[PDB]
């Protein structure tokens with residue numbers, strides 16, 4: 342067991358191994374607070390997240406377990422990786438805090454209108470990481486610029502920090518379709534890619550109705566083939582009662598963009614999710630000709646998310662989380 346030290350940063354107490362020095366707060370959200378630190382063991386700058394109230398409720402405890410399981414699985418250049426996970430607890434009985442450590446990245450895409458060469462490389466990386474994530478049967482569901490960490494070298498990693506999320510959300514999610522697929526993430530990437538090219542939010546909807554309205558203005562109201570797939574009477578009544586609109590010509594909307602970026606946007610932002618390009622297909626699109634290497638776009642080990650269906654007690658989720666802390670093997 343490392344020697345731990347304690348301090349207070351912004352009304353939150355931090356108990357971390359002495360390996361990590363010079364903690365400075367960088368931000369805080371609903372599910373944690375984050376510090377930058379220097380990792381004396383590796384010489385790396387790192388980000389340390391202290392989970393907030395990880396075991397307060399069954400719900401929290403399951404969310405904690407979910408986050409740790411996911412982070413322990415991710416082993417890809419374009420997805421956040423876990424460098425360390427620790428707790429100051431010496432036994433299960435006293436276990437009430439979880440800290441996660443990852444490489445510190447310069448900034449995020451929300452901080453960062455870009456050159457086309459930069460767009461190619463950034464979107465290539467997002468899709469490369471998505472091919473990986475999707476191959477594990479995981480859907481990110483909240484892709485947006487602030488969830489894309491980018492260093493000064495333009496290297497990019499997908500994460501979730503857990504600008505409205507709804508702006509990047511697929512139209513089928515606005516409609517509350519229960520059976521959406523992984524291409525909800527492709528929709529988000531199309532929205533991000535548009536914004537990088539234009540410097541403007543593609544669909545800055547004020548609420549879910551407005552969001553759908555703005556979307557359909559670009560991509561057209563549903564065609565007959567898509568309408569046949571809609572099970573909800575009320576949704577069909579609503580959609581069919583709209584003034585019908587054709588799909589816009591993207592070449593005109595994205596005036597003066599690389600025609601290949603236009604073509605890829607068309608393939609990502611098709612309204613019917615069944616017709617959208619997949620991450621793996623997108624990597625092979627001519628837009629990424631300078632980056633694409635089929636022998637360097639790996640898939641993930643399978644990921645068991647059977648736990649999602651389980652209803653367990655707080656202490657059981659806590660013990661499962663503790664098991665995962667203990668079994669953690671740091672990367673080489």
Ligand SMILES: Brc1ccc(-c2c[nH]c([C@@H]3Cc4ccccc4CN3)n2)cc1
Pocket residue numbers: 375388389390408411412420421441442443474479480481499500501502503
């Ligand atoms: Br697909 C997918 C990929 C990643 C995530 C995820 C969960 N938690 C996080 C990071 C972990 C972390 C660790 C240290 C410092 C800050 C942060 C910020 N949240 N990413 C979820 C789904």
Ligand SMILES: Fc1ccc(-c2c[nH]nc2-c2ccnc(F)c2)cc1
Pocket residue numbers: 359360362381382
């Ligand atoms: F090889 C080394 C040894 C120590 C350091 C170091 C610099 N500042 N603080 C520390 C420190 C304090 C307590 N425990 C540690 F592991 C590190 C850096 C590299």
Ligand SMILES: Fc1ccc(-c2c[nH]nc2-c2ccnc(F)c2)cc1
Pocket residue numbers: 512513516517518553563567570571572573576580612613614615
């Ligand atoms: F106004 C609309 C109508 C349909 C969609 C849509 C896009 N892809 N898939 C669907 C869909 C499929 C099955 N059932 C649903 F409810 C939705 C999105 C907005």
